Amino acid sequence: MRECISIHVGQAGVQIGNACWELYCLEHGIQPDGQMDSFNTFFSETGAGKHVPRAVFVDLEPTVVDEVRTGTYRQLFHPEQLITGKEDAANNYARGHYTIGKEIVDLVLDRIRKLADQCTGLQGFLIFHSFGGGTGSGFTSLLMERLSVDYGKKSKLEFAIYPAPQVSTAVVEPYNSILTTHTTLEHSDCAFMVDNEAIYDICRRNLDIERPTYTNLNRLIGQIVSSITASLRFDGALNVDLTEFQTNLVPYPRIHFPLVTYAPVISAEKAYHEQLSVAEITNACFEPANQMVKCDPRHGKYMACCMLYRGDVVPKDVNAAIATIKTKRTIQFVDWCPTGFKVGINYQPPTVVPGGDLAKVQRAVCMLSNTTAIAEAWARLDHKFDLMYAKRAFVHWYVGEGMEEGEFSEAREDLAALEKDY
Amino acid sequence: MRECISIHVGQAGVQIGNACWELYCLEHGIQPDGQMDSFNTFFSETGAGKHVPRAVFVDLEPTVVDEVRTGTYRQLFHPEQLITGKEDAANNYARGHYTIGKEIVDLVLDRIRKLADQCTGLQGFLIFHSFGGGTGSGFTSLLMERLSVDYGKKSKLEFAIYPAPQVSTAVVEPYNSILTTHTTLEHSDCAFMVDNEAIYDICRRNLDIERPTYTNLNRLIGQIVSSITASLRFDGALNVDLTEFQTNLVPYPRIHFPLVTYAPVISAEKAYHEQLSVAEITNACFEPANQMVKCDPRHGKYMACCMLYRGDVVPKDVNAAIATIKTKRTIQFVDWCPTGFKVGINYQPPTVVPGGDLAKVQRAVCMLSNTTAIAEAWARLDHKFDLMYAKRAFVHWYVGEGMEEGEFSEAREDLAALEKDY
Amino acid sequence: MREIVHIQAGQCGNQIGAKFWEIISDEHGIDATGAYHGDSDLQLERINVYYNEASGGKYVPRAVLVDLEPGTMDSVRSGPFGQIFRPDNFVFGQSGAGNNWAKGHYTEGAELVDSVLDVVRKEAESCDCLQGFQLTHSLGGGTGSGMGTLLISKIREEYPDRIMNTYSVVPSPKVSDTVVEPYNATLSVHQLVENTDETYCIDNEALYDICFRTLKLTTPTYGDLNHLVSLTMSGVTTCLRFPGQLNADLRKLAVNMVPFPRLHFFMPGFAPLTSRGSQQYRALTVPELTQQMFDAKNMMAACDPRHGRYLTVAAIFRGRMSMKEVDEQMLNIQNKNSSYFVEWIPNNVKTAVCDIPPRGLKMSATFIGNSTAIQELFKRISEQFTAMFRRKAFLHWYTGEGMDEMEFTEAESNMNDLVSEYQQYQ
Ligand SMILES: Nc1nc2c(ncn2[C@@H]2O[C@H](COP(=O)(O)OP(=O)(O)OP(=O)(O)O)[C@@H](O)[C@H]2O)c(=O)[nH]1
Numbered sequence A, B: 001m002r003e004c005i006s007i008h009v010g011q012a013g014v015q016i017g018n019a020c021w022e023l024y025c026l027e028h029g030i031q032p033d034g035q036m037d038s039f040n041t042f043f044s045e046t047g048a049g050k051h052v053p054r055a056v057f058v059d060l061e062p063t064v065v066d067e068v069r070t071g072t073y074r075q076l077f078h079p080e081q082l083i084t085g086k087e088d089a090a091n092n093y094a095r096g097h098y099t100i101g102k103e104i105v106d107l108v109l110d111r112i113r114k115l116a117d118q119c120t121g122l123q124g125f126l127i128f129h130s131f132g133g134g135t136g137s138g139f140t141s142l143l144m145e146r147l148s149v150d151y152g153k154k155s156k157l158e159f160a161i162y163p164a165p166q167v168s169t170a171v172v173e174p175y176n177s178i179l180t181t182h183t184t185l186e187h188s189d190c191a192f193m194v195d196n197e198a199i200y201d202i203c204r205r206n207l208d209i210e211r212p213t214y215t216n217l218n219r220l221i222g223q224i225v226s227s228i229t230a231s232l233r234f235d236g237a238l239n240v241d242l243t244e245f246q247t248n249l250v251p252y253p254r255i256h257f258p259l260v261t262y263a264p265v266i267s268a269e270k271a272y273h274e275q276l277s278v279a280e281i282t283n284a285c286f287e288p289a290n291q292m293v294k295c296d297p298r299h300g301k302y303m304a305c306c307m308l309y310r311g312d313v314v315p316k317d318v319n320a321a322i323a324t325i326k327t328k329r330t331i332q333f334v335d336w337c338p339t340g341f342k343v344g345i346n347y348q349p350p351t352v353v354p355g356g357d358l359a360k361v362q363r364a365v366c367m368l369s370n371t372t373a374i375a376e377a378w379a380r381l382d383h384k385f386d387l388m389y390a391k392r393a394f395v396h397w398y399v400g401e402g403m404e405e406g407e408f409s410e411a412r413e414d415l416a417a418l419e420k421d422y
Numbered sequence C: 001m002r003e004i005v006h007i008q009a010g011q012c013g014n015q016i017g018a019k020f021w022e023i024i025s026d027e028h029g030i031d032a033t034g035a036y037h038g039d040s041d042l043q044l045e046r047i048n049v050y051y052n053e054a055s056g057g058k059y060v061p062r063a064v065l066v067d068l069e070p071g072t073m074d075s076v077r078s079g080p081f082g083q084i085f086r087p088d089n090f091v092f093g094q095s096g097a098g099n100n101w102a103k104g105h106y107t108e109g110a111e112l113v114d115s116v117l118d119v120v121r122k123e124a125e126s127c128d129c130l131q132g133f134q135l136t137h138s139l140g141g142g143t144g145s146g147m148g149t150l151l152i153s154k155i156r157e158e159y160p161d162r163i164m165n166t167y168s169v170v171p172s173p174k175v176s177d178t179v180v181e182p183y184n185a186t187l188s189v190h191q192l193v194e195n196t197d198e199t200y201c202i203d204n205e206a207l208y209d210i211c212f213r214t215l216k217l218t219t220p221t222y223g224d225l226n227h228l229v230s231l232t233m234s235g236v237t238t239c240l241r242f243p244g245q246l247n248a249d250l251r252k253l254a255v256n257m258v259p260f261p262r263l264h265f266f267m268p269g270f271a272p273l274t275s276r277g278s279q280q281y282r283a284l285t286v287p288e289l290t291q292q293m294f295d296a297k298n299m300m301a302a303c304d305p306r307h308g309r310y311l312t313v314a315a316i317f318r319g320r321m322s323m324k325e326v327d328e329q330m331l332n333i334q335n336k337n338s339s340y341f342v343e344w345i346p347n348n349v350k351t352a353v354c355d356i357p358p359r360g361l362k363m364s365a366t367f368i369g370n371s372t373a374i375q376e377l378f379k380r381i382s383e384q385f386t387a388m389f390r391r392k393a394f395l396h397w398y399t400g401e402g403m404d405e406m407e408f409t410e411a412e413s414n415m416n417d418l419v420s421e422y423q424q425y426q
């Protein structure tokens, strides 16, 4: 026995946390109130037939928190773990990092500290947020360094909604993205991808949902986190811990930004049309378009590859499929990283939702790597930042939060050094 | 056995001395009259159950002295240690330095000399005053050089109320500030910060006192001096003397202006909301906004850092917290000063007042350093002096006290040389 | 939560605010008296932003009515939905500035500033959190511009952190309704460059031509202008008032539209706008709107953006569609309108969607864009001001109210600097 803590900041973070808790509740049979020992990794035993999520819901705006506290799962969540803000940063990293974040970071730090107090087997921290959101950038970053300074070497996992190259809710998104990336770089143990446009494209072409909604995105995150945490929440042939995830993909602290991909995303009518075998599902998932990242991995080199099989998957078939994956030349690896393969097998089949896009299947695989194509996105973001900051636009907004342009500039050069480190 | 002498000049100095003596009396259980051996560092044993403060209260105006001699602590203070003036300098350094100060410096010099006569273990001198006040600048400076010439190398500690960049009671404050700084620079062993605006901001945001009063400021000084003098007034694991304070932070006589900060400043209702651990309180105190100085220390380099823990604080936890403070890059130090850390541990918990803003706590830490950000304030003051003296305004007031503009100019260049010495 | 206080100046401003209020009563399911009858919880969940908690299950608009004459006062109160306003919000003068900025700002504004500040402070304090303000007035009129300037100055000196927008009505270049209206526009803009965070410029002749041609009406009236105004109204404020998959507010738009503090003038937009025998035949799809987003026909403030360059574009949508179509449409808009767009502001389209469509339309689209086309309008205003100030004509009316020469000189210098900066951006 062991536990983990999930952190949700901003609208995207709150929605993601709610969806993930919906998964964890329906997978273990939790009714909306909390009733009917691996489920203790995310829920706490007190009283009689009771469980509550080990999470904190915080946002500078109370709209999403109000929406959460109006669902049928009010009884499921403790009221005190929901935090309501008053002044949304409005896509401003500095606003949510200094003006409102500094006076509300205390209660959250403080009581996630108790969440660790009753969880002596705290494996790590889960963070869900968005770069585009000013709250989800600033408050998330500051609480990230607060976690680092209050816990030391404790493992921490970040799930960030990176704005897409052509999808941006706010035009000031480069400022928030660069600022948060420079601020939390040294402490970000592992940060993933989310490309909204790639999610929409995959849903429209794979699930063939011409009119999807953010619920599809919500379980897109939900199924990813479920596949990641199945090892901790269910036994398997070779379970994988959170520590090994950062051990394999962080030989150097500078590069800790791996991309994620799921296989498969198939509707029930199309699930009738295809049953999964290891070779086909892996080679489909390794296909660049199947990746939920809008960056072709074949442009650069591959760091490492991690497989997360769940269900009735034969390890020998895994080895054979992975080998025949290796031999083909569409896949290339760095010279000094010949053997960077870790496989995690779990016996728990992926869980379905009623009325969901995904189809109920006994087996699945999670696609886990850090390709060099992320450098393309980083360079494009840096170029956009240079263009839109060259005339110094929207800077006065961050100035009114009380800093001058210097920190913007050296964050730009820090991220440039990160980009050229490849 | 040993003693120390506290000097109070001007309205601010008199109020500060009164507040500090209130602390020293309530900490040791002194009733307003003086009754019920470490308390002998500030009080003298004569007769039966008697103690009186080892202090001199002097001001060019008798308003504050009259206010002091009308409180319930008339019996506590000897009448003869209160000095009443007749002509306040009215925010004029020259007036209080020549016109009225020169004919009343004699009795005070003279009888603080007896205060040293019966105190053979005189550790040093404590001086409390204000740069903005003409009395607290001129008379304080002249008595400072008189102390230097009548005692030689005796340690002397100065507590000055430096006017804030945007808070100034008098518009002629640059004249008094520059003049006193140039006059007492060579003899000022150690001078601190007081920023009134920073005090108000911290009280309004940390203590959440929307309507504070100068009593909060009075114990802001009172708690600072108590934390400084706890080593002399109470034993500890590693007590620190006044001499070591100037030994560590004055490798060169030019730079002897360290800033001070306390941790924490938390009300009783918020004290219910947070209990102190070493890592969190230190990292909060090192935060620039927690500093009671309106200068961001991250602009420049750090000279040295001194910790003054009081209460049940583990030295091993101190070392671990200080190390993890060192590793993080928000803190930087000069190349030729790698090891500038001194830690003073005391077993006496900080003392509370009834009806006070601070909450009664068994442990506290005092934040003690000399950052380069003081150069920013010095440069801004010099620039304001240049602007408001360029047309030679308010100079005739100092002329009527009988000097020409030259000394103003070379004081300006002396402080410019001090500024560029960084 | 995020309460917004409405202040209306001038007869046109009062009519516009009233029409807004009936439109909000439609959108939120409020009858002519104030009772709620909406069929969905979404209308009444965020009713507190524009309404207050009234006893007896009622709601009253958070409005402030200001005028120097009670003629339009009585017409508005006796008109439709006049009982939904308490008599206290109606404060009026008795002299009338007579289309004079100086009179309405100093002579008659002296005894109205106290009343307007008292009522706005009452509205601010009686609410939970005032997110911002919205003002409507006409720059062509003299009194309304003076009230606009005075109120923005008092708000800036009282609530410097609370942003707002001003929906001023710039006089039409083609028609000189008032001889001294160039002075009114001069002083109003000189105060707007200084007391307003962002401003939408609404020009008459453009909406007149839209009603004439796009709507195909042979008898355009003030009613249709107020209707389209209320559509702009709802289009901007629906993201805050109604739930959305991409939630937005006035603060988001202000952050996305203001690159420099003096560069804050934008030109609002609405679509689709089609008649009965075209709507049943037109395509009720996004492309029919994206061909309508960028056009000099359905264009709001009479200066062609094609001559200049767009600064950035904001697009809010209300209906039932997916989001990727919007993103690819915006990308195509860039691809084809690259010359008309700015090269150094990539992806300058601000995309947000409100879930709830307006009453009676399953889409409406509000085009919030900024272009250097307003440079032409400002330059023409400046040259007109120079033309009839060189002759020193009609200066006596202003100088009799405590006016001065070089004051107008720095006013015209401020517009000169503004137009020079806009040209430099171009
Ligand atoms: N993938 C995904 N992203 C979402 C979802 N909801 C919101 N987002 C992200 O949120 C961004 C919009 O801004 P928010 O993060 O909501 O900002 P906010 O919550 O208002 O916080 P502030 O900007 O500080 O006021 C978009 O760019 C999305 O990337 C969702 O359901 N799925």
Ligand SMILES: Nc1nc2c(ncn2[C@@H]2O[C@H](COP(=O)(O)OP(=O)(O)OP(=O)(O)O)[C@@H](O)[C@H]2O)c(=O)[nH]1
Pocket (backbone or CB within 6 Å): B010, B011, B012, B015, B060, B061, B088, B089, B090, B091, B092, B096, B130, B132, B133, B134, B135, B136, B161, B162, B163, B168, B169, B170, B194, B196, B214, B215, B217, B218
């Ligand atoms: N922090 C703090 N400062 C004080 C307090 N009381 C007075 N001061 C300082 O005193 C200054 C006002 O001038 P004074 O020092 O009182 O001058 P004075 O006592 O009249 O002496 P002269 O100017 O020579 O007449 C202010 O700028 C404050 O900085 C206090 O209670 N707390």
Ligand SMILES: Nc1nc2c(ncn2[C@@H]2O[C@H](COP(=O)(O)OP(=O)(O)OP(O)(O)=S)[C@@H](O)[C@H]2O)c(=O)[nH]1
Pocket (backbone or CB within 6 Å): C009, C010, C011, C012, C013, C015, C016, C068, C069, C096, C097, C098, C099, C100, C138, C140, C141, C142, C143, C144, C169, C171, C177, C204, C222, C223, C225, C226
């Ligand atoms: N769109 C629209 N414009 C209007 C309406 N009423 C008046 N206007 C325009 O406003 C301009 C006059 O502004 P107005 O507010 O009447 O000046 P005023 O200063 O307030 O007039 P007065 O009170 O001193 S007499 C005219 O050019 C007219 O076209 C209206 O109901 N809708």
